Design a binder for this molecule. Sequence first.
Ligand SMILES: Cc1cc2nc3c(=O)[nH]c(=O)nc-3n(C[C@H](O)[C@H](O)[C@H](O)COP(=O)(O)OP(=O)(O)OC[C@H]3O[C@@H](n4cnc5c(N)ncnc54)[C@H](O)[C@@H]3O)c2cc1C
Ligand SMILES: Cc1cc2nc3c(=O)[nH]c(=O)nc-3n(C[C@H](O)[C@H](O)[C@H](O)COP(=O)(O)OP(=O)(O)OC[C@H]3O[C@@H](n4cnc5c(N)ncnc54)[C@H](O)[C@@H]3O)c2cc1C
Ligand SMILES: [Ca+2]
Ligand SMILES: [Ca+2]
Lengths: 309, 391
Amino acid sequence: TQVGIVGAGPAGLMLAHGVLEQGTVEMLREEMHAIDFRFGGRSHRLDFHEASGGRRAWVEGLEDDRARIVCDFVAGCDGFRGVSRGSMPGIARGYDRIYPFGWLGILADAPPASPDVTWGCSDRGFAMMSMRSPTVTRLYLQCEPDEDPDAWSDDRIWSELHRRLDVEGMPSLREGPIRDKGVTAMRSFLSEPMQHGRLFLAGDAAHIVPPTGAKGLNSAMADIKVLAAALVDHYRHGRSDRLATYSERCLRRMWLVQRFSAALCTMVHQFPGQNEFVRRLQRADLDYMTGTHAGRLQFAENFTGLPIE
Amino acid sequence: MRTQVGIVGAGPAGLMLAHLLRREGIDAVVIERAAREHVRTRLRAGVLEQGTVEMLREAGVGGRIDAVGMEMHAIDFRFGGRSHRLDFHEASGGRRAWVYPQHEVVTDLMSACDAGDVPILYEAPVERIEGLEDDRARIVFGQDGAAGEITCDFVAGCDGFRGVSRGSMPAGIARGYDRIYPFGWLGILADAPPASPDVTWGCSDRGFAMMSMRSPTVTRLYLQCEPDEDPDAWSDDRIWSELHRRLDVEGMPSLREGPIRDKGVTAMRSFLSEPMQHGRLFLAGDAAHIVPPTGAKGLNSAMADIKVLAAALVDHYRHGRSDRLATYSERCLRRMWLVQRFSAALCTMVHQFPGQNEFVRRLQRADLDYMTGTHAGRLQFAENFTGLPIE
Ligand SMILES: Cc1cc2nc3c(=O)[nH]c(=O)nc-3n(C[C@H](O)[C@H](O)[C@H](O)COP(=O)(O)OP(=O)(O)OC[C@H]3O[C@@H](n4cnc5c(N)ncnc54)[C@H](O)[C@@H]3O)c2cc1C
Ligand SMILES: Cc1cc2nc3c(=O)[nH]c(=O)nc-3n(C[C@H](O)[C@H](O)[C@H](O)COP(=O)(O)OP(=O)(O)OC[C@H]3O[C@@H](n4cnc5c(N)ncnc54)[C@H](O)[C@@H]3O)c2cc1C
Ligand SMILES: [Ca+2]
Ligand SMILES: [Ca+2]
């Protein structure tokens, strides 16, 4: 064939054809207004819809004449554990930072106590309440990176979620039967370049982020929006400049996405043994982000999605 | 020997407070450990926030800043081989900063204090501060071996990072937050007229450097160096070599060299102590908090503390209300944690950290790109650099 797509993820199916950015929605087409950051015993509802001016969120032979997937071009869409990223010659460079924690996630048959996605930036550790339906809620707890889910009974999970999320004046967390308990990792990684000859990387094969900020899929999509158009210009108008600049343009937008994702991750989680000045700057960062127009503006523009080149 | 407010330290914070109190009729005595001639000739550059300039102007000591203070509109951030001129006057909607050296602020304030007969004791190091919950506080000092005591309603601890007032808090009350960064600054003056007029920051992966105007014919230059560094390990040739490497970009004039003088090394540290008051003791300025000099914030923060403290003391003596004294620390700390955030953000973005994680290192360029390249980034920089509001 012309284009050999490795991996059948959301990036692999978007080229052949959680929380989503407005750009990801319109790309699929072609509903969130605020996040409640809780800290210091108080709710801080950051209306990013208003601050953003109306944007919203929603819930072998790569140098030869032909490439061979054991086609003209190979689209690496095989995620963080695929083989496409290692399919390059000294060409690749890796930027890696793992965070000293994971997330314990549950799906509960209980109505959300509030309609906004809620971030509990507690000194016990991070917690998050997100919705799915008026009767189904999605919840996360910061936990040890290698945590055994068997150590967390249903009662332990609800107790800790209450401690990390409840504040006076807001409805308390509603409890219900628990489904889909699991532990997921927290890691920042990016690899350069994102192309080499006939091999083009996208999505998790190129770069992973911590889920704080909901960017891993939305960046995979923008990766595909760019790779798809370049292949269109190549096959339709005989124009190869877009393919040659694929890595350059994806990396520009992604390094700003890594920035935002990491900024949230390092702000809302507790780091064991951290320098006490750096630890107190987490609250200063939360106060500035929620409490000033400039802080709210930067959050709103980044959360709803950066432009795509 | 008896007064209303005893002020420990005749640096900018103490002199400003003595001056404000004098014009409100409130009696104060300033006690300073060094010699007047020493304090008067401590030369230090200075970038003043607009609020600081307004404060000096409204206290009758802004005449010379109004006459020769050099209005500053932009910083040139150099990285990735290019200049990025961030116009914070535009980004902030018209607020700005002024280049006006700290030693001339101190000259201005000392002249105002002397013209108002404010009593200042020099060569009189304070040894203890006691009676913080007595009817009147006691400042125990010595000139030579002569023991002295000043009795006062309130003690303003304006004696800097190395003073005695911070340690006079009951240690079960005070909490410190401290980070020493793993680098210092090698600083020089060069007898060469500045090639570019803007404050210029070299922020590339080769290491931090800074260039600014000391005077029309003298350039101030800083280089990131090792924290314990001997200035004698930096010959003139090594200095110019590193400065060219860290600052020069195509499309901007190359560095103008000239005689090097005033070579020295300074440390980089973020520190804040809580609370800023206990009983009759109120801390202000470097006695309470210091920042790394990226961002031009230490003197301006000391002046913000003094603005709040003087107004609280006026409310107490003039209007008989003590609630503003009661909230001094709460209000000053809220601002100062945001100043610490800003100074720290600049410091961790523009310096190379030895052995740093390569992902975290590359986010430095992402942060520079976002701060210079987006309206939202420029706005935040500009509002912080020109000065946050004061409560
Ligand atoms: C807990 C959690 C929450 C998240 N929340 C959000 C969110 O709210 N918003 C958001 O935008 N993102 C979110 N993400 C990130 C997002 O889910 C991922 O970034 C996304 O899966 C990336 O898509 P991808 O197709 O590139 O990778 P994947 O989805 O991992 O696709 C890789 C595919 O390739 C296949 N494959 C692997 N190796 C090979 C091989 N050798 N040959 C063939 N096939 C192979 C795999 O089996 C898999 O099907 C979250 C991630 C986690 C873990
Ligand atoms: C190189 C450099 C550049 C800077 N640039 C800027 C800038 O552009 N903008 C900015 O806002 N800030 C800047 N700063 C920070 C600023 O200089 C300080 O924050 C400022 O000096 C703080 O003033 P202060 O009155 O609190 O303390 P200090 O100036 O330290 O004065 C304290 C005084 O107390 C006296 N004292 C100490 N112990 C005793 C004792 N026991 N008894 C009596 N007296 C005592 C000392 O002798 C001294 O005179 C810079 C700092 C440096 C090092
Ligand atoms: Ca088990
Ligand atoms: Ca007594």
